[PDB]
């Protein structure tokens, strides 16, 4: 069993630090502007996609349709 709150805490911290703290720890070379852009854009794109994937699975309206042999197999597997 899982809660939703904890996944959010762990992945929000992970991607948050990357997009928030990451830019603080960047070389002073000519690519500084590019590196910061990538750090933030990456964290936002990746976090959003995951957040959708997990939220879409909350409060489900229906479960899966499994085949009889599959149902049996799971009963004695998990």
């Amino acid at each position: 069993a899982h809660s939703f709150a904890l996944p959010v805490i762990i992945f929000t911290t992970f991607w948050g630090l990357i997009g928030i703290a990451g830019p603080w720890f960047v070389p002073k070379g000519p690519n500084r502007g590019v590196i910061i852009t990538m750090l933030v854009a990456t964290a936002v794109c990746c976090y959003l996609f995951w957040l959708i994937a997990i939220l879409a699975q909350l409060n489900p309206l229906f479960g899966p349709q499994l085949k009889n042999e599959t149902i049996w197999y799971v009963r004695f597997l998990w």
């Binding site: 000519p30 590019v34 852009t37 990538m38 854009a41």
Partner: protein, 49 residues
């Protein structure tokens, strides 16, 4: 040893669009340029591409 002095003129013709690229970003700039060359001092989409 002629002084060879290069003096700026009142720039007033459309200048070329120069985006500094490197071994990594050059490829991304090209797929942008394939669609078109941005307006002078346009926001370069490549860093987000």
């Amino acid at each position: 040893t002629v002084p060879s002095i290069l003096n700026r003129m009142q720039t007033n013709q459309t200048p070329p669009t120069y985006n500094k690229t490197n071994k990594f970003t050059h490829g991304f700039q090209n797929i942008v340029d394939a669609y078109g060359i941005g307006t002078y001092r346009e926001i370069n989409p490549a860093p987000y591409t």
